[PDB]
Design an enzyme around this catalytic site. Sequence first.
Site, PDB file in Angstrom:
ATOM      1  N   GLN A  11       3.186   4.083  -5.811  1.00  0.00           N
ATOM      2  CA  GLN A  11       2.845   4.979  -4.708  1.00  0.00           C
ATOM      3  C   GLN A  11       1.782   4.377  -3.801  1.00  0.00           C
ATOM      4  OE1 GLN A  11       1.711   8.908  -5.937  1.00  0.00           O
ATOM      5  NE2 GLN A  11       1.577   9.685  -3.838  1.00  0.00           N
ATOM      6  N   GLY A 135       1.471   3.578 -13.761  1.00  0.00           N
ATOM      7  CA  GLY A 135       2.545   3.057 -14.587  1.00  0.00           C
ATOM      8  C   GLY A 135       3.540   2.221 -13.805  1.00  0.00           C
ATOM      9  N   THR A 136       3.904   2.672 -12.603  1.00  0.00           N
ATOM     10  CA  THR A 136       4.852   1.915 -11.791  1.00  0.00           C
ATOM     11  C   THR A 136       4.219   0.638 -11.253  1.00  0.00           C
ATOM     12  OG1 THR A 136       5.999   3.957 -11.190  1.00  0.00           O
ATOM     13  CG2 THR A 136       6.406   2.026  -9.822  1.00  0.00           C
ATOM     14  N   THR A 170      -9.583   8.230 -10.532  1.00  0.00           N
ATOM     15  CA  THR A 170      -8.804   9.458 -10.587  1.00  0.00           C
ATOM     16  C   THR A 170      -7.939   9.612 -11.828  1.00  0.00           C
ATOM     17  OG1 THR A 170      -6.733   8.756  -9.541  1.00  0.00           O
ATOM     18  CG2 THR A 170      -8.633   9.099  -8.105  1.00  0.00           C
ATOM     19  N   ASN A 197     -11.076   1.546  -4.103  1.00  0.00           N
ATOM     20  CA  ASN A 197     -11.004   2.807  -3.376  1.00  0.00           C
ATOM     21  C   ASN A 197     -12.383   3.275  -2.927  1.00  0.00           C
ATOM     22  OD1 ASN A 197      -8.208   3.414  -5.244  1.00  0.00           O
ATOM     23  ND2 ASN A 197      -8.214   3.997  -3.078  1.00  0.00           N
ATOM     24  N   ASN A 219      -5.701   3.514   4.095  1.00  0.00           N
ATOM     25  CA  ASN A 219      -4.625   2.543   4.199  1.00  0.00           C
ATOM     26  C   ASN A 219      -4.535   1.914   5.580  1.00  0.00           C
ATOM     27  OD1 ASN A 219      -4.181   3.547   1.643  1.00  0.00           O
ATOM     28  ND2 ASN A 219      -2.406   4.783   2.239  1.00  0.00           N
ATOM     29  N   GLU A 245      -1.467 -22.313   3.587  1.00  0.00           N
ATOM     30  CA  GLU A 245      -2.777 -22.947   3.642  1.00  0.00           C
ATOM     31  C   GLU A 245      -3.841 -22.169   2.882  1.00  0.00           C
ATOM     32  OE1 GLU A 245      -4.159 -24.004   7.482  1.00  0.00           O
ATOM     33  OE2 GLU A 245      -2.386 -25.185   8.009  1.00  0.00           O
TER      34      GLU A 245
END
EC number: 3.6.5.-
Lengths: 430, 429, 427, 427, 68
Positions: A11, A135-136, A170, A197, A219, A245
């Site tokens: 995510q 996990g992902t 979190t 974060n 982001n 480079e």
Amino acid sequence: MREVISIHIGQAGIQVGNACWELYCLEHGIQPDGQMPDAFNTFFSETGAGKHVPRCIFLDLEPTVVDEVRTGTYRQLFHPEQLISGKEDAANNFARGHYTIGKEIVDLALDRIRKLADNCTGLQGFLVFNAVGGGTGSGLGSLLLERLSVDYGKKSKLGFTVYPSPQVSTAVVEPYNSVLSTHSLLEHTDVAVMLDNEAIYDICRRSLDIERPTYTNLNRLIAQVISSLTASLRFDGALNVDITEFQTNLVPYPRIHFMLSSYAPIISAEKAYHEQLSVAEITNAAFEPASMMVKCDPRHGKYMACCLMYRGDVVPKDVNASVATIKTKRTIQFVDWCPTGFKCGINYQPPTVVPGGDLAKVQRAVCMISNSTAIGEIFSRLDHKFDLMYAKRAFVHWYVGEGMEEGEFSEAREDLAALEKDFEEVGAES
Amino acid sequence: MREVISIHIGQAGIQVGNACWELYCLEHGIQPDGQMPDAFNTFFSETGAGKHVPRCIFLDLEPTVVDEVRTGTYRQLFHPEQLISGKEDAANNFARGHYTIGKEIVDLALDRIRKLADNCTGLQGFLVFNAVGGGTGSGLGSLLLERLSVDYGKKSKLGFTVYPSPQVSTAVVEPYNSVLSTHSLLEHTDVAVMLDNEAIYDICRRSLDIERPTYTNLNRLIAQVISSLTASLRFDGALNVDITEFQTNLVPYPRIHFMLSSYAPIISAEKAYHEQLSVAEITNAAFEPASMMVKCDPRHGKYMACCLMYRGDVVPKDVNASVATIKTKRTIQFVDWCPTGFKCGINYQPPTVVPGGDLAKVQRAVCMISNSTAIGEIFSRLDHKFDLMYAKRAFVHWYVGEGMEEGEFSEAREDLAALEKDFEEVGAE
Amino acid sequence: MREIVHIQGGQCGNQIGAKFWEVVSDEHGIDPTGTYHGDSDLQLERINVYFNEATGGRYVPRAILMDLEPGTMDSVRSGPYGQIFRPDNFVFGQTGAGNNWAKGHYTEGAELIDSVLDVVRKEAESCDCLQGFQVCHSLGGGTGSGMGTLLISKIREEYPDRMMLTFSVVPSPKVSDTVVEPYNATLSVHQLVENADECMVLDNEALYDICFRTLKLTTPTFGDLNHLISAVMSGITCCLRFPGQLNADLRKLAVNLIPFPRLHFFMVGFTPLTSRGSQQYRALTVPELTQQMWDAKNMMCAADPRHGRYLTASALFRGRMSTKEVDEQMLNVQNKNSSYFVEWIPNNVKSSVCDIPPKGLKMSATFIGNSTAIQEMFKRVSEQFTAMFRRKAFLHWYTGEGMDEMEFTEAESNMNDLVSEYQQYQD
Amino acid sequence: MREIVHIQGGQCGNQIGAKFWEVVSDEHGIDPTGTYHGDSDLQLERINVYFNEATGGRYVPRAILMDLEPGTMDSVRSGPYGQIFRPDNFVFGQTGAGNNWAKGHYTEGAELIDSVLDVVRKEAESCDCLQGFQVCHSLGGGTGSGMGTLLISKIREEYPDRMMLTFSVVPSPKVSDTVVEPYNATLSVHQLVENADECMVLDNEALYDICFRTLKLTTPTFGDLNHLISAVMSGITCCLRFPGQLNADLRKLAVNLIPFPRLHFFMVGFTPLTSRGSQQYRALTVPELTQQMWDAKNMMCAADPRHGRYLTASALFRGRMSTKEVDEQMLNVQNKNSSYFVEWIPNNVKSSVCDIPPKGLKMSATFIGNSTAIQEMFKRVSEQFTAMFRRKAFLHWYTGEGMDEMEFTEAESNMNDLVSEYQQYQD
Amino acid sequence: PGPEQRRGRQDLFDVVQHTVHLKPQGYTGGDQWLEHKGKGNAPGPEQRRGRRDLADGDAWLDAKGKRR
Ligand SMILES: Nc1nc2c(ncn2[C@@H]2O[C@H](COP(=O)(O)OP(=O)(O)OP(=O)(O)O)[C@@H](O)[C@H]2O)c(=O)[nH]1
Ligand SMILES: Nc1nc2c(ncn2[C@@H]2O[C@H](COP(=O)(O)OP(=O)(O)OP(=O)(O)O)[C@@H](O)[C@H]2O)c(=O)[nH]1
Ligand SMILES: Nc1nc2c(ncn2[C@@H]2O[C@H](COP(=O)(O)OP(=O)(O)O)[C@@H](O)[C@H]2O)c(=O)[nH]1
Ligand SMILES: Nc1nc2c(ncn2[C@@H]2O[C@H](COP(=O)(O)OP(=O)(O)O)[C@@H](O)[C@H]2O)c(=O)[nH]1
Ligand SMILES: [Mg+2]
């Protein structure tokens, strides 16, 4: 032709990826449908009759982050097959993203990558985006990076990964997944750029004077780093620094391949006009601990190899003057055996600003990617968290039941301990 | 390129600085929004394209004085982060502004002083604005002046301090804060300039015929003197007198550096037509006892050295003539070891007028900043009031509550007593 | 074909020398740009004495403008005749001397003296061989005094047989333009008695009353005061820049005006001073140029020449005049005034006649006076220095940069030995 | 009939060579479209030295642009004077050197060096007589430092009787643009000490000082620096392209400036550089050019010539100049500071004159210096290389493309051998 | 395009070829000597005056007395 492929896993990779592809579309004039009213070949493949599609795949076991892309305002940009979804998420289980669920989707994942790697004429590298806490991100990220090295050898894997904060995090099982992901990320990627974060929270609170920031503010300036990273492939410049480079000019040893990031002019609209933005002014602020994008103090460690990517109206002499003033400042310390320590890259394109973004337009900008011995503080603090919960085997029964064995936590601890020991000796004065 | 970085500490410093930076924008033609519609480089920085920012910081622990600037007509002028605020004020406690509540703001304050000095090529001096009778002006001013010495070595610092008035006062712990603050600014301030409210309000009552004056009227004529002090850097003339001049031409010994101040033309609009303003007239009027900024008497002591800064249409002939006539007057007497009594300086431009202000448009001006042996009179009276105050420990539990040791009170008493014996000894023949 | 390098120091030197190059440019027919516009060929034979020929007919002066506070050179750059000087010759400091002699001699004069010697040495071999060096400064200051005197000491170190002609402004008798005038003057004289060859002592308060009483000027200013000094510096080198019936260069005046090596301080007068309303009334004749020359009011030094005897006098006459009209009027002043002249030197007055008068003058002359009456000015400066040094007033600044109190005693001794030697030859 | 083949390698050399053909074609009169549009006839005798005749009056440079990245192909091609080169001579790679010296020399250069030797052999066979191979590259990079030195060894083995002009910039003292300069430079100098006939040492920071202290340009881009480098390269072959009073080709410079076969690195300076504020004041004459010639700040190398003794210098004077006035100025600098010159080589300096100056500037000169002061530059790279190599930093890359650490010890051994013989001759 | 076209000086050929007199007057470019301005200006006592009485409102001619 120069050409890069970005895989966004988890995510955090997708939500950052929703912001990076929002930035390149405004920069190259590509509308959300995918049609311009030469430089786009780095990120976009020109398809048929006047359409540009991104060279990215979006894979995540949880579809609910992916279907925002399919039904959003960028539904006509991406290829439908490039947005790869799954049935159920790994759900903060590294054993589910690497062994149980990730094995079904990684066979499909390499198929669409082989389509993009066949469409290129010259491939320069990969841009992995993931978070080691999930996990992902940890599981499917390790599996995708494992298969990419065997299939496409000696190619650069520029993995911009997000690590947990030492204080403000979190997820509970974030220390477990970070160690198991580092055991695979250490030996596979070529350049890994830590993002934190909480450090970006302090950047937005102080410099951007936003009291209550969210992820979509975070982001955007992460995407400012990626655009500043690859601006030398798309736009011309006085001192071009290709992606190939970077790894030959940043990593001294095969195991020390962790670097920080810092974007120097981060000011709001009402702050920008009163501020006399000069090249020496932004260069001094880039080495400040306030503008670092990882929560660490660079005065503790020593900088080892730093590269500056000047975007915009910068002549090659004010970088000559500013670097000299930086080297003579007593707070910044380099390692003894690397007297040359700076890489200066200048690109003539000023940074683009998104409407609704909290950055105003600035004529000059600096992105510093720094290899430092202070990253050992970022990995010892997560080594301390992994030790306490494994001291009485917390949360292990979720990983053991889903394919992974008990023993793999032991050498993951040993591999992270071998990395901290390697960081102390490379900073040792000889 | 010449540059002076002004700092304004406390409510007295900020409100004078509100009148000071109003006069600076009027001289060079800076509109209040920050844009002009080469001479400005000593106070303003040309920011990007068509925008100038002041080279100052307004720092105070009480937010009420700072945000009046941030809500006033000059909200677009100052940089929004150059203005420094605080959660709670020192509130007339020298221990609070120095030890317990001033320490948390001084780390951020020098971070802007570092960046302002990096923006400037050659720094010429510092301007410090405070009143020693308060908490932030004395306490945080002691923290700021001391910490600027260890960071900015051998750089001149003009200290424009407003001392407590002899007869009238606005606070009860003013003798306490004045003695402690003088202990800090004696060893650190390169040149100290004394201001007093009663003498300025006596100036407004006699010459400017304003029977009901306020702080707004008081701060403008202080601002006019300071603009005349740095007028040599701003504008060219016959005998330019820069910042390092006042350091060595007024301070004979490393302790005697508390000087007076005087502005000779203080004339309202309707009085100016009937007054013939000649250099012989105003130099006589500059040394008059009713015209100093400090309620101390000239003829009680002897002058050490005097600086006549002239502005406007002044030829170098009559400054030569009038200074000789000043020396021949037997009402005033100099010290016996300084036959060369004066230093002169003439700038070629008249002072500007604030629209709506009380001062009239005068073609000539004098900034009479002189060193005298009579400074001990305003020090002994503050020394005597603190001695009676400290007789049985009045208002001491507040100061010793906030970290300060009891021994620091008696140490400051010895320091002014050391200063008291200095002026009698040096002025003696 | 003889060349002079000019160096200006501080606010006083730069503003005086700006008016110095003002007068010699229009005397040589030089416009503000640098081209030639004179109506005679006599100007162009001797241009290399003060100018260097450039491409396109431009003439850059042989001037090195030097100081420590950069605001002074913005005044000469903005003024008329301010676009002539070479920008490499525009050497400057940033902090400013602050009227401290030792600060202008040890701390910030140290980094600048390397730069100004690179410019001066490059200007040295730019010509054939120097006639000498001319500087203008003020002894009471800190920029022209502390840094100028070290410049004089080093330029004599490398160029020992070359000449020095320092036009120095001494502190006032009556008033004080800086409070540290006696400290600066005593330290400046202590250097100047060895390294300098000729010191043209000029004082403001003798310039002022010339403007007020002889010239009747109601509003004298530095523009007017510098022009009197500028008229002198053109008159000393009149025979260098022009043919004359009886010529006199710097070395011609050097061997005459100096009886003994320590005595080289001169009082200077410029002769044809008349107010505008009295222009038509005065007849210009050689006898009345001499009568205006020998008056004590006409001297630009505050020392009164009646109180001392003239050791040696030199008058530099310019114009179409006969060589005996300058002569028997010098015999008359030695005969009618014999007590004011020195008995152990017969024929004290030295003459020189130049064929080219200045602009707008049919006749002109410049006086140089080496008299023992200047000792009372130096004794007056010595008196103030003794008063301050015993109580060490205004003195911790000079010792802040390491110049010890020994040097003040050395300066006072060299001042007191010099004022006694003038008294010794007065007897 | 003395033709020169130009080959450009790397990002630095190609951008430098883009400015080289910017200046030479402006000098010879060729417009960007390739046709001749000059006004003089002297440009039309020797075009063959740098250009080839094409059908229809087109003039194509004898240039071979070789690189591993298509990025710097597009920068040269899109600028002015970019269409002049042949489309067949735009040979380039796709992967990129990546600032890796081993990738340029061994892995990626191998698939391209055969392709570029086809082009170099094609151009050399076309021209009547080879007078040298002029290669413009860098030493801190990987595209022109690694792959370029492979081209040096390749051309030198089928063409062993022709000179090599390796114009190479070196790492700067004050800053550093890559991080593997000591690794890149020490290996590139190892190839240059045998195969290259003579080398021209350049650097960025000496050009920055020239652009700022001398030319007073506040904002120097790379175009300003490359024009200073291109002004050098026109001066080397000044006698080849134009007739001259005393001719000197590249071999005559080589036989004089090189006393010993390993001492072929030179420090180079271009003389007539003045700021825009100082054009109208500087009177350019032969003594004035010579004073700027031997000044340490006019050198386009970081080595201060005051430290080392000049083994051999040569002067490339261009313009209508008196022959002895050229020579006696070189005789003046031989004797006014003779300690800076080598005693056992009498008559160190060489003066050559060409009567066709560059456009607009009637007097010009180019300085070539074989001084042992350049040992400090190679000493700096040696001490920077030894610091990194003992800790084996940045080494897992270079050992990856088949370049073992045995070669890197040999680079340091040959680096120390070069500085040993330079220090040997200081005594 | 880079910052050079924004600054205004294009290619340094003027400085190299020494033909700067062909340029329009006032072209500072990037010359630190040309782009220097400071210290302000003010007439002061130079109004309606000049030193000419040596070369032949002031003086005794501006002396006044009683009406005749
Ligand atoms: N910078 C940034 N970080 C994010 C964002 N979204 C999530 N993260 C980080 O990701 C962490 C959670 O791990 P993830 O890898 O995102 O979890 P996931 O992608 O849902 O993986 P699964 O739970 O297995 O489906 C949080 O602790 C955040 O710090 C984002 O939008 N921006
Ligand atoms: N010159 C001048 N002095 C003022 C002005 N306003 C107040 N003062 C003086 O300031 C004194 C109070 O001391 P300060 O140091 O200013 O008090 P403060 O700045 O509010 O410090 P804190 O109370 O701790 O916040 C009073 O005695 C007044 O005489 C003004 O406008 N101009
Ligand atoms: N005649 C004349 N004298 C000047 C001028 N400027 C300054 N002075 C004299 O110089 C003396 C002080 O010079 P000062 O400025 O202190 O010199 P500096 O600071 O060392 O350069 C004063 O007594 C003035 O009379 C001028 O323009 N003309
Ligand atoms: N003089 C000059 N030097 C340049 C220019 N561009 C790059 N360089 C120099 O080239 C070096 C970097 O090497 P690089 O260009 O990557 O060489 P490459 O890898 O062979 O292409 C730096 O030291 C720069 O100073 C230019 O336009 N002019
Ligand atoms: Mg998820």
